[PDB]
Design an enzyme around this catalytic site. Structure first.
Site, short mmCIF file in Angstrom:
data_model
loop_
_atom_site.label_atom_id
_atom_site.label_comp_id
_atom_site.label_asym_id
_atom_site.label_seq_id
_atom_site.Cartn_x
_atom_site.Cartn_y
_atom_site.Cartn_z
N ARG A 243 0.81 -1.24 0.00
CA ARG A 243 0.00 0.00 0.00
C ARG A 243 0.84 1.29 0.00
O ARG A 243 0.54 2.26 -0.69
CB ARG A 243 -0.77 0.07 1.32
CG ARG A 243 -2.20 -0.11 1.17
CD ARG A 243 -2.76 0.00 2.54
NE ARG A 243 -2.68 1.38 2.96
CZ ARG A 243 -2.02 1.77 4.04
NH1 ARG A 243 -1.40 0.87 4.82
NH2 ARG A 243 -2.01 3.05 4.33
N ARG B 292 -21.51 -26.42 8.70
CA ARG B 292 -20.43 -25.99 7.84
C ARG B 292 -20.29 -24.46 7.73
O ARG B 292 -19.47 -23.98 6.96
CB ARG B 292 -20.66 -26.56 6.44
CG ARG B 292 -20.28 -28.05 6.31
CD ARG B 292 -21.28 -28.77 5.49
NE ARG B 292 -21.05 -30.22 5.34
CZ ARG B 292 -21.33 -30.83 4.18
NH1 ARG B 292 -21.80 -30.09 3.19
NH2 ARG B 292 -21.12 -32.14 3.97
N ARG B 293 -21.03 -23.69 8.53
CA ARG B 293 -21.11 -22.25 8.44
C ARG B 293 -20.64 -21.54 9.67
O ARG B 293 -21.11 -20.44 9.93
CB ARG B 293 -22.57 -21.82 8.23
CG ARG B 293 -23.17 -22.39 6.88
CD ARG B 293 -24.73 -22.27 6.79
NE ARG B 293 -25.34 -22.84 8.03
CZ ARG B 293 -26.64 -23.06 8.19
NH1 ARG B 293 -27.47 -22.79 7.21
NH2 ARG B 293 -27.11 -23.54 9.33
N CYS C 184 -13.58 -8.42 4.12
CA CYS C 184 -12.93 -8.74 5.38
C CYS C 184 -11.40 -8.87 5.23
O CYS C 184 -10.87 -9.05 4.13
CB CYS C 184 -13.58 -10.01 5.98
SG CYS C 184 -13.01 -11.56 5.33
N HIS C 185 -10.67 -8.76 6.34
CA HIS C 185 -9.24 -9.04 6.31
C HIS C 185 -8.96 -10.59 6.49
O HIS C 185 -8.08 -11.18 5.84
CB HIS C 185 -8.47 -8.23 7.42
CG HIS C 185 -7.03 -8.62 7.48
ND1 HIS C 185 -6.52 -9.39 8.52
CD2 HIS C 185 -6.04 -8.49 6.56
CE1 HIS C 185 -5.25 -9.68 8.24
NE2 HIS C 185 -4.94 -9.16 7.05
N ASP D 294 1.91 -11.01 6.68
CA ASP D 294 3.30 -10.58 6.87
C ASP D 294 4.05 -11.71 7.55
O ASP D 294 3.88 -11.96 8.80
CB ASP D 294 3.22 -9.27 7.67
CG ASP D 294 4.58 -8.80 8.21
OD1 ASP D 294 4.59 -7.73 8.91
OD2 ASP D 294 5.63 -9.46 8.00
N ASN E 276 -0.35 -14.13 14.87
CA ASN E 276 -1.65 -14.69 14.50
C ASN E 276 -1.88 -16.18 14.74
O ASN E 276 -2.95 -16.57 15.26
CB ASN E 276 -1.91 -14.38 13.05
CG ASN E 276 -2.60 -13.08 12.89
OD1 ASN E 276 -2.08 -12.17 12.27
ND2 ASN E 276 -3.83 -12.99 13.40
N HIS F 180 3.84 -12.73 2.44
CA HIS F 180 4.95 -11.88 2.02
C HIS F 180 5.92 -11.66 3.10
O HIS F 180 5.60 -11.75 4.30
CB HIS F 180 4.44 -10.56 1.46
CG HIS F 180 3.60 -9.79 2.40
ND1 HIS F 180 2.23 -9.94 2.47
CD2 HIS F 180 3.94 -8.91 3.37
CE1 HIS F 180 1.76 -9.20 3.46
NE2 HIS F 180 2.78 -8.54 4.00
N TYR G 194 8.69 -8.73 4.11
CA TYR G 194 9.23 -7.35 3.86
C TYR G 194 10.74 -7.39 3.61
O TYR G 194 11.43 -8.14 4.26
CB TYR G 194 8.89 -6.37 5.00
CG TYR G 194 7.52 -5.86 4.84
CD1 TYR G 194 6.46 -6.44 5.54
CD2 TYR G 194 7.23 -4.89 3.87
CE1 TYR G 194 5.15 -6.00 5.36
CE2 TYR G 194 5.94 -4.43 3.67
CZ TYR G 194 4.89 -5.00 4.42
OH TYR G 194 3.59 -4.57 4.25
#
Lengths: 260, 260
Positions: free
Chosen positions: A25, A126-127, A145-146, A168, A176, A206, A208
């Protein structure tokens, strides 16, 4: 059987060897691969990565703040009011925001209680699905959403798949992995299930450019056995968990790596 | 390099060996594994599976109907009006439905044109994201999607990741792999990019008990080289593609398998 952290190191190595240059970005450079997955067992172990010391205390405190649905940065513009952002979507999705001290009970969709209630009413479902980057909410209508976490129940074991649109690898991914694995343990405890697997899928995985060199060194370290996570009290409701309820044990990581 | 269909056969074999019994909505039995991914190159080949003849013509015609945003079952209650369902979400998400002959231009979010416009305005974007099971829409507020496709652009190649919350391995998965790969070619053609990879991720990957035996036989077949997909005219806009624009070539599958 091979240590699950080997998945992560393998993914680092693949991005280093095979990633292509791609700008984020802000126009900062990365090495990027599209499409990646890893699975980490939660059975009798907890995937706190061992090739660098992961900030466990901060993982715990940020998750508890998300769970509380807070928009008060200070609990973690002047007064520190972040607007209708973060755990506000987990607990009050779609409610008209007034202020960070307002009362939102019964307002909006509570995705989190909804997940727990479905686990209890129909475990086969399943939801069983529950996050947005704050910057995206006012940018468009129906903003993507992210992250999406899907839960799955079989033989009284709770498993979780977290799909993130970008990851990242050096900084965010370890944090996470520990964060969604901790949530899986919390919910499994309250619904009387046992943790099963945590599966992490990523879109743009990715590295950096700046992290390349510390990551090269991290790769030459060998994983130690994952620790255990022990919940110390019987807890009844998700909103009742406290930082002092959790104890990590047998955690012997390699030294901290500071990534830009 | 190994044929990409080997991924699929490998996943079948894994569910057979390692899947656990789990019931669907209707209480019908499956063998299930949580969390699976496969990648299929789109470079100079098209992943129409070769271990059974896949219904290519039907893949094409259903996608064109979705693209058109139709709610008229007959184009594929009495009159055949399905309500605000399917490609209606791809092209008019959130618009007040009147009838299947009404005009919806400029109404709701057009996810599809939005994807194409972002590809053109910012190819680096990590949010290039676009489907609901019709049964879910009125069942709750903020109902979870069935599938999310994320697109990714690098070195003038378009890649697509399709995450499905559940995947019927015997019937749905092959049809879907061809369907999202066809969409990727369509959009790549109109945005002047080359197709790159198609990545399929699934939540509850399952085999219906009934399909076990035909699938055992399918596994003993050896993949043949994937065909090519050739787009036969220069096409400018997504809504302008016609079934006669596409030609499959060098497709030599094994015989049809009928799965219940």
């Amino acid at each position: 059987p091979p240590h699950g952290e080997l998945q992560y190191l393998g993914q680092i190595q693949h991005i280093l060897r095979c990633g292509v240059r791609k700008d984020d970005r802000t126009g900062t450079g990365t090495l990027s691969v599209f499409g990646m997955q890893a699975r980490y067992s939660l059975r009798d172990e907890f995937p706190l990565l061992t090739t660098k010391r992961v900030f466990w205390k901060g993982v715990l405190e940020e998750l508890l703040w998300f769970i509380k649905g807070s928009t008060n940065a200070k609990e973690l513009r002047e007064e520190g009011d972040l607007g209708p952002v973060y755990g506000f979507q987990w607990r009050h999705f779609g409610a008209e925001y007034r202020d960070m001290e307002s009362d939102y009970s019964g307002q909006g969709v509570d995705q989190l209680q909804r997940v727990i209630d479905t686990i209890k009413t129909n475990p086969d479902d399943r939801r069983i699905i529950m996050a947005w980057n704050p910057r995206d909410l006012p940018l468009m209508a129906l903003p993507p959403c992210h992250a999406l976490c899907q839960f799955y129940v079989v033989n009284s074991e709770l498993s979780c798949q977290l799909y993130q649109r970008s990851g990242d690898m050096g900084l965010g991914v370890p944090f996470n992995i520990a964060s969604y694995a901790l949530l899986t343990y919390m919910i499994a405890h309250i619904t009387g299930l046992k943790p099963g697997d945590f599966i992490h899928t990523l879109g743009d995985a990715h590295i950096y450019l700046n992290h390349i060199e510390p990551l090269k060194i991290q790769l030459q370290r060998e994983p130690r056995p994952f620790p255990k996570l022990r919940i110390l009290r019987k807890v009844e409701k998700i909103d009742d968990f406290k930082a002092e309820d959790f104890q990590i044990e047998g955690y012997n990581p390699h030294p901290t790596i500071k990534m830009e």
